[PDB]
Amino acid sequence: EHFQRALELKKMVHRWRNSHTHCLWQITLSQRRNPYAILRM
Amino acid sequence: MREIVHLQAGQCGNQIGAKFWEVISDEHGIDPTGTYHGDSDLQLERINVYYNEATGGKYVPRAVLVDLEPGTMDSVRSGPFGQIFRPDNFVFGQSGAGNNWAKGHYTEGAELVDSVLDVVRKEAESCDCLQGFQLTHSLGGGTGSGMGTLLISKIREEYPDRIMNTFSVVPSPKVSDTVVEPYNATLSVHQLVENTDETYCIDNEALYDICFRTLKLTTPTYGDLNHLVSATMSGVTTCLRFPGQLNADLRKLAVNMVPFPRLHFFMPGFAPLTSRGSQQYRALTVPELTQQMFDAKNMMAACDPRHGRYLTVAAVFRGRMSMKEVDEQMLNVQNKNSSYFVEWIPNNVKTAVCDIPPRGLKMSATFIGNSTAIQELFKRISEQFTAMFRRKAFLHWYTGEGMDEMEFTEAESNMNDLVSEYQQYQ
Amino acid sequence: WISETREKMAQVCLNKALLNEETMNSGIIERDTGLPATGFGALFTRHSPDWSKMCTLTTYAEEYAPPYEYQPLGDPCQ
Amino acid sequence: QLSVSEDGYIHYGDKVMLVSPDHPETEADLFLPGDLSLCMTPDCGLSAAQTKIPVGRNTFTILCAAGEVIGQVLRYGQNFRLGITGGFDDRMLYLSSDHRTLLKSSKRSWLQEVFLTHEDSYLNCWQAAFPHPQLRLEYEGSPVPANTKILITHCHTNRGLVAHRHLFLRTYFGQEAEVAAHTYLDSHRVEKPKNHWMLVT
Amino acid sequence: MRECISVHVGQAGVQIGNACWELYCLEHGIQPDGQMPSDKTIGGGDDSFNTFFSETGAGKHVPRAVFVDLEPTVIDEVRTGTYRQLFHPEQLITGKEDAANNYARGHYTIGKELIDLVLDRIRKLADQCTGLQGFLIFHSFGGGTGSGFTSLLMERLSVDYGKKSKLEFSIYPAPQVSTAVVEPYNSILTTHTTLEHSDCAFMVDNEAIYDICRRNLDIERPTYTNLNRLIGQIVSSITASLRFDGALNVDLTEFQTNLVPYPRIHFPLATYAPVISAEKAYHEQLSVAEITNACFEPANQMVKCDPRHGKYMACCLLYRGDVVPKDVNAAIATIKTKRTIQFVDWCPTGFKVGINYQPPTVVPGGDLAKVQRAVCMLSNTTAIAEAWARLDHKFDLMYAKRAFVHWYVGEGMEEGEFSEAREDMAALEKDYEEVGMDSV
Amino acid sequence: MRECISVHVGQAGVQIGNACWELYCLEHGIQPDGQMPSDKTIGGGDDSFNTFFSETGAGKHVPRAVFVDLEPTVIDEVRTGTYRQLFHPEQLITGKEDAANNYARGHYTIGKELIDLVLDRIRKLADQCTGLQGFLIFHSFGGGTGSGFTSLLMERLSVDYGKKSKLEFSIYPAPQVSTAVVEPYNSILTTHTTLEHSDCAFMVDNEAIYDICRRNLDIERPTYTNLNRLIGQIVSSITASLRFDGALNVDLTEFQTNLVPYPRIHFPLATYAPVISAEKAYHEQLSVAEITNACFEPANQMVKCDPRHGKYMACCLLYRGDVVPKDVNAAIATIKTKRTIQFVDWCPTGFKVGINYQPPTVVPGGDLAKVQRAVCMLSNTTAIAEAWARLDHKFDLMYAKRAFVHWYVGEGMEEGEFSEAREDMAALEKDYEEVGMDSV
Ligand SMILES: Nc1nc2c(ncn2[C@@H]2O[C@H](COP(=O)(O)OP(=O)(O)OP(=O)(O)O)[C@@H](O)[C@H]2O)c(=O)[nH]1
Ligand SMILES: Nc1nc2c(ncn2[C@@H]2O[C@H](COP(=O)(O)OP(=O)(O)OP(=O)(O)O)[C@@H](O)[C@H]2O)c(=O)[nH]1
Ligand SMILES: Nc1nc2c(ncn2[C@@H]2O[C@H](COP(=O)(O)OP(=O)(O)O)[C@@H](O)[C@H]2O)c(=O)[nH]1
Ligand SMILES: [Mg+2]
Ligand SMILES: [Mg+2]
């Protein structure tokens, strides 16, 4: 059950890292994908 | 009212439907900044079939854009049509798959399925009436053939009532681009034949023929080849898309084109093709389109109708047209070359129409059809798979993610009895 | 007296149109009166492409016009 | 052309452009070098470019919010409006904001946000004040001179326009700076050079 | 964000990474003292450089690879050179005494004492490596540090980071030119260990580039810095799909899934097509077939062996710049008419394509011209069995006299490490004879 | 309000009472005259400094501190140093003869006549406060005043004030090197006496910061000032939340609540995270997870005692700079029970977190640069039971042949105090052995 709780907090930290990658990509997706539209202009 | 769910995967798929949502934006008259700037109130009538409404008067599609990496969703956001796709409609893993089915089907492609399954059930159940599912999968790679072709197996688990139709990218003929393609195409066919109900087949060396033999281009690109792939999707739905004389839909053609559950193996086409300088000099009338869409070089699946026989043939038409002189053109070609069907079916053709030709054009068509010389297409892969399995070549990429050889022993037993159906009808 | 890596990296360290976007307005057009016509009209190629438009009416919408003209009507009642 | 100041003080009806004075601070580590002037920004928004001459994209006409006359001496801690003329025949635009919710957050830092809008309300009035905390109530309601360090404060949030030169907004112009509204106070609880402003003529 | 934690080892890897890491500074807008002139990169830059350069609160772009040796005496020129403010003070691991053409001290005695401070730095650099699919290794079989330290790492990374990719831009010791003498011992023993732990091996050798810069380039009397840019461009077209846009961006698993069919065969070649001088290129004509058909003629290969004796078996491509994809279809279609260019029966498909936008940026002060189309066909071939049998033939002849052996028992080995690295190469010579064996 | 007095004992107390209080002068706006400069703008009603700096009317800020020594040649460097006008002369207590590396000299004979005046002055610096959070004791176990007079300061302080906070930061002897020889007699006979008269604690060994400075910085040939500066950087972060605001807060009553499970087991450690040089600060960018893992690594520890052998009894964290509570709480969660990190089962939640916005301040002439995140972590362990076991080892070794003992009996002292101060650590070695037992 110690293994159960430790690998529980393993799921929680993996989920938070996954969501950090996801959220970071969408907000700076807007930010860094504006300039190639300006270069095509 | 009978909306269509746009499904994709991979980097081939997203670089195909980057042009499908160009011509829907062209034909409904949609600026790439959200609003509407069209020339009539017919296009705004049936406009929620491909464009959900919101505040600000705008229109985002039912857009599902998937790959197993952010490798190609950077290019659609900064393409010409980029701020009409939704920021929450790019689903991604981290590591791209890269040329195996198993990590697309079991480990990397299969782990991220619980965000496609969210966005379908959030969107498609909130449609007032969906009509079915349309998915284009990169059939020759590892993500589209792996992850999207998993979803083809697992939304046909949920709703079996609807219609499944694909625009698949079957492997090319003479020049070949990836050595795992006599596996990731051999194995997907084992999944398709019980879990697809129309299968269109698209070949790029069969579509570089058109921009040299017909449309007269020295330098073609993908933004040139993919619009004849947007023809086979934006121009078959025209009975839902615009009013007119006679409206026959996508369910109305699977009744008329396939007679069987093991036959859904189509062979597409597109009628009004010519050069660019000679646009003024060829008259686009009744005899010209019917003379065009029956030849070998006006067909997109890289096979020959001479070596076998068709069974069924469908044809959208558009624009104001006469229906008598169209009929005597297609009653003739059922009868002049009487070898090139079977004599145990009465007729083969279906005529649907519309009112409005696609913008720029004036009198158009499209072409759908089953044929039993697509059995040659699925024999060149099964020729290659026999000359690889016996040396056990390349195989350790496949057991490393949990598959066995029993996915491999029966992905030729399926491709044997499939062609062992088309051999009688010959 | 210096080494080759330092030498090559030091060498790496040491290593118009008439109408512009500011001229596009004042360079005028449509002058000297060349004859504009098609075929053998011999003008430079004018703004004559087959422009892309959608046909607003259909068969039903054209042939079911009011057969005879009339004064439409008024609100049915107040 | 801006309007000259006879006496030192800034009346209404004067064409005046808004610029943050140059900072000797070093704690930020990211630093546009000096005298950063506020500007209208389209893709509208608002952001301060580098130091600029009066170009009409900068020029603010000092209007009246409490029904004042065209020429009237302005005192600290009193409402006024600062109006940017549009490029075409648009009459007036308003330096605006809103009390923060989750969804109206500023770009590149999730703070209060300041932008431009047509409509008129009390979210358009601003009042400027003395920088020294011990002297505010001594010099409150006194004629404010031409080119002097004064803080810009709202009258419904009591926050303040921040020269937030940590982050860069690359624009069409490429000159950069991010502007929000937030009050900063030191360990001695005094107003930073992050928030100062100067209304040049 | 996509990444590449590349690995360099030795005199080899630091006078290669003086010329390989020169280009990543040069192809992006990276100036040689950390920063950027802020002139906007082709496409999106903020994701294009993040395979190499990261950011701090000074705007300072600092790389993410590693340079290892067992001395300061060649690392110090990086430390006292043009690029001194750019690299990190603890990304440059040093030793004190070089392994001195030994596999004995290099693997165990002067390996174990210094392996541990390295592994802080990788696991402190691999924290923020979100998209990184492997490790890319630049080592030397014929030396001490490139072969002793390196295969000490190769038995360790596979334990820790599991089933990750490993591909090697490795400096193969050459067929005729002798730099050292007893380089069979450091090369055959490291290919007893790495061969079950790595997964692909790009193979280059120095003399077969010295052939090329005399006859394709016209430079008489070149150096390593002349040679190290041709390998230093081969690395940067392989990487070039993650970085700058194109029709066919290519993931890091496309390499090792299409160049290697088995576990114990993972030995391709390396070839790079438009190798032509800076002044004569504009009176010859660069066409896509001439760029394509140059790489199957053996004078452009970077291993002196011949495919006339053996057989091609798997291949690749990566075009770049102005590429019409119809011409790629109608250039490869001419190779399929040859019997002098032979395949085995069990790779009927054969190829792979990657396409970018960028024409290849040229180092200012170099040898090659400003070309606009480049393709590099990293490809398997079963005629390294002739090449491997000559670093093998002269080992059997030497051991019969039992020569040079006493300095290898004397630092932490037995005599049994010598026998099994002939027992392993015996079965590999019993292996390429059946991989290329036809089926009737 | 919210006052907290410093009481530093020894010449080590005065070498610490200069480097701490020079940071405190430039952490706030203080000049060495004492007055903040005119043209420095403060609103006046809000005073951050008022825990430490008192105030007259004119603006002079005299610290609430007293220094203790018994030989004048260390405070006379203070009395005519740079800060000779800031420190009020009454506060700097000097003897005339020093207790001279002994216990009973400074505990019964010589220190007896200097507890009279210091007790007079602490009632003149603790009447001014409304709420005194606690005193602090910075003493050295080695010398006579830091061992003898310090414990006699402790016992009298219990009578006079009862249950105020009395923390200590003690300069424990290093295990290998030392100032002297007779230091264990002064290091156990104070620890046996400062058990019931001590609230919370910390430890430092002098050789342990010597390890950190060379392996993390390039400051070769350090000095005690280059160690006394880091002691300032770790005391400031203890009290960082008292004066400046935060998303959370830690007061001085608050270590003992969450780190003292039993009122004799009050022995944490100390660690400061981002030890990195000014030319290494610019290159490597840092995150909150990056600074936490350093405090978990044994190299950053301020003791020569690895908690890998022991169980983390409880923890405390003091974050600083631009930290988010979101990413503070992510690396906290990333650290485990199953790692080399390992907790007792009777402490399941296991932490305390305090967040201060105000970034740490850089002193002229130090070593560390303008770093932007930091950690002051104070983790108890069962591993301190080997630190007592080595000092038990080397005290009964010196007590076997009954050495130096004539220097202890005749200085107003009894005899059996050696026989009980070895007995007392024997039970407290058992007490620290049963605090970490798994649940039965
Ligand atoms: N052509 C070329 N050859 C190189 C280059 N760098 C290293 N070499 C070859 O590498 C071999 C040199 O041996 P080392 O790499 O110094 O051996 P080591 O692995 O470093 O081991 P130690 O010398 O003991 O430190 C020679 O064959 C060189 O020709 C290079 O940049 N270009
Ligand atoms: N770790 C550390 N130890 C210090 C520092 N300064 C002094 N010390 C220690 O202080 C001890 C010196 O003895 P003290 O107690 O300070 O001398 P004292 O207070 O005059 O006592 P007596 O010499 O007996 O009169 C030695 O152990 C030094 O190592 C310091 O800055 N850091
Ligand atoms: N017609 C067309 N074909 C494409 C396009 N992009 C990729 N392809 C084809 O799809 C294949 C690429 O497979 P890929 O997408 O990498 O496989 P995946 O890893 O499963 O997504 C190649 O054979 C290409 O010829 C495109 O924009 N248009
Ligand atoms: Mg070396
Ligand atoms: Mg003393």
Q: Phi, psi at residue F280, to the nearest 5°?
A: -100, -10
Please answer whether residues E267 and E168 qualify as being in contact, where contact means their C-beta atoms are separated by less than 8 angstroms: no
* Interatomic CA distance for residues B97 and B93, integer angstroms: 9
Q: Which ligand is nearest to the CA of E139?
A: 1
C-alpha angle with apex E229: E225 to E231, nearest 5 degrees? 115
From chain E, pick out residues whose CB is under 8 angstroms from the CB of C14.
365
Going from the Cα of E161 to the center of ligand 1, the distance in angstroms, rounded, reads: 28
Please answer whether residues F274 and F351 qualify as being in contact, where contact means their C-beta atoms are separated by less than 8 angstroms: no
Atom of ligand 1 nearest to the CA of E206: 1
* Interatomic CA distance for residues F20 and F23, integer angstroms: 5
Kindly report each contact of residues F43-50 with a partner whose C-beta sits within 8 Å and lies 24 or more positions away, as own/partner: F43/D133, F43/D134, F43/D188, F43/D189, F43/D190, F44/D133, F44/D134, F46/D188, F46/D189, F48/D187, F48/D188, F48/D189, F48/F243, F48/F244, F49/F243, F50/F1, F50/F2, F50/F3
Q: Look up tokens 């950190």; give the residue.
A: F212
Cα distances from E394 to residues D81, E175, E185, in angstroms, run 91, 11, 11
Regarding the beta carbon of F99 and ligand 2, being less than 6 Å apart is answered: yes
Helix (H, G, I), strand (E, B) or coil at C32: coil
> Per-domain residue ranges for chain B?
3-257, 265-374, 375-425
- Which helix (H) or strand (E) segment holds residue B251: the answer is helix B251-257
List of residues 6+ apart from E190 with CB closer than 8 A: E103, E141, E147, E148, E150, E151
Please answer whether residues B140 and B169 qualify as being in contact, where contact means their C-beta atoms are separated by less than 8 angstroms: yes
* Interatomic CA distance for residues F57 and B420, integer angstroms: 106
Quote the radius of gyration of chain C (alpha carbons, Å): 34
* Interatomic CA distance for residues F64 and F91, integer angstroms: 9
Q: Which ligand is nearest to the CA of B76?
A: 3
Catalytic residues of F: 254
By the 10 Å C-beta count (0-12 exposed, 13-18 middle, 19+ buried), B128 is classed as exposed
Q: Which CATH architecture has domain B265-374?
A: 2-Layer Sandwich (3.30)
- Which helix (H) or strand (E) segment holds residue D129: the answer is strand D126-129
Closest Cα in chain A to D110: A27
Identical fold for domains B3-257 and B375-425, yes or no, is no
Per-residue tokens: B333: 């070609």
Regarding the beta carbon of F111 and ligand 2, being less than 6 Å apart is answered: no
Strand partners, D114: D97
Cα distances from E126 to residues B146, F273, F287, in angstroms, run 29, 20, 14
Q: Measured between CA atoms, how close is A33 to chain B, in angstroms? A: 6
CA atoms within 13 A on the CB side of D91: 4
Please answer whether residues B97 and B142 qualify as being in contact, where contact means their C-beta atoms are separated by less than 8 angstroms: yes
Question: Which residue, by CA, sits nearest to atom 13 of ligand 1?
Answer: E143
By the 10 Å C-beta count (0-12 exposed, 13-18 middle, 19+ buried), E21 is classed as buried
Cα distances from D143 to residues D130, D159, E236, in angstroms, run 11, 22, 65
DSSP state of E171: E
* Interatomic CA distance for residues F30 and D159, integer angstroms: 30
Cα distances from B404 to residues B102, B401, E177, E427, F60, in angstroms, run 10, 9, 48, 28, 83
Which is it for strands D150-154 and F203-205: parallel, antiparallel or unpaired? unpaired
Across the interface, whether the CB atoms of A21 and B94 are under 8 A apart is answered yes
The experimental resolution of this structure, in angstroms, equals 3.4
Q: Measured between CA atoms, how close is B24 to chain A, in angstroms? A: 21
Helix (H, G, I), strand (E, B) or coil at E343: strand
Question: Which residue, by CA, sits nearest to atom 7 of ligand 1?
Answer: E12
F433 annotated ligand binder: no
* Interatomic CA distance for residues D159 and D152, integer angstroms: 8
Going from the Cα of F140 to the center of ligand 2, the distance in angstroms, rounded, reads: 6
* Interatomic CA distance for residues E266 and E296, integer angstroms: 20
* Interatomic CA distance for residues F89 and F84, integer angstroms: 9
Q: Measured between CA atoms, how close is C1 to chain E, in angstroms? A: 14
Across the interface, whether the CB atoms of A39 and E46 are under 8 A apart is answered no
Across the interface, whether the CB atoms of C3 and E77 are under 8 A apart is answered yes
CA atoms within 13 A on the CB side of B341: 21
From chain E, pick out residues whose CB is under 8 angstroms from the CB of B384.
348-349
Q: Where are the beta strands (DSSP E) in F55-102?
A: 65-68, 92-93
Task: Tell me which residue of B383, B418, B380 sits closest to B172, measured CA to CA.
Answer: B380
Query: Cα E224 vs. chain centroid, distance in angstroms?
Result: 15
Query: Cα B38 vs. chain centroid, distance in angstroms?
Result: 27
Quote the radius of gyration of chain B (alpha carbons, Å): 21
* Interatomic CA distance for residues E188 and E173, integer angstroms: 11
Touch E-B: 3+ C-beta pairs under 8 A:
yes
From chain C, pick out residues whose CB is under 8 angstroms from the CB of E225.
4-5, 8
Signed CA dihedral, E396, E402, E406, E407: sign only: negative
Please count the other Cβ atoms lying within 10 Å of the Cβ belonging to residue B423: 10
Please answer whether residues F137 and F20 qualify as being in contact, where contact means their C-beta atoms are separated by less than 8 angstroms: no
List of residues 6+ apart from E252 with CB closer than 8 A: B96, B98, E133, E134, E165, E242
Across the interface, whether the CB atoms of F337 and A16 are under 8 A apart is answered no
Helix (H, G, I), strand (E, B) or coil at E173: coil
Across the interface, whether the CB atoms of D172 and A38 are under 8 A apart is answered yes
Cα distances from F346 to residues E193, F296, F436, in angstroms, run 47, 21, 9
DSSP for B184-204? Answer: HTHHHHHHHTTT-S-EEEE-S
* Interatomic CA distance for residues E388 and E425, integer angstroms: 9
Per-residue tokens: E343: 């395949």
Per-residue tokens: E123: 């696991």
Per-residue tokens: B18: 């980057």
Which CATH code is given to the segment(s) B375-425?
1.10.287.600
Q: Phi, psi at residue B419, to the nearest 5°?
A: -70, -25
Q: Which CATH architecture has domain B3-257?
A: 3-Layer(aba) Sandwich (3.40)
Q: Phi, psi at residue B370, to the nearest 5°?
A: -75, 145
Q: Which residues line ligand 1 (CB under 6 A)?
A: E 10-12, 15-16, 70, 98-101, 140, 142-147, 171, 179, 206, 224, 227-228
By the 10 Å C-beta count (0-12 exposed, 13-18 middle, 19+ buried), B343 is classed as exposed
Atom of ligand 2 nearest to the CA of F101: 24
From chain C, pick out residues whose CB is under 8 angstroms from the CB of B356.
54-55, 58
C-alpha angle with apex E98: E95 to E102, nearest 5 degrees? 135
Cα distances from E244 to residues B12, D49, E17, E45, in angstroms, run 18, 30, 22, 8
Please answer whether residues B195 and B257 qualify as being in contact, where contact means their C-beta atoms are separated by less than 8 angstroms: no
Please answer whether residues E34 and E86 qualify as being in contact, where contact means their C-beta atoms are separated by less than 8 angstroms: yes
* Interatomic CA distance for residues E427 and F172, integer angstroms: 64
Q: Look up tokens 């004879």; give the residue.
A: E433
F416 annotated ligand binder: no
> Is D30 in CB contact (< 8 Å) with chain E?
yes
Please answer whether residues E273 and E230 qualify as being in contact, where contact means their C-beta atoms are separated by less than 8 angstroms: no
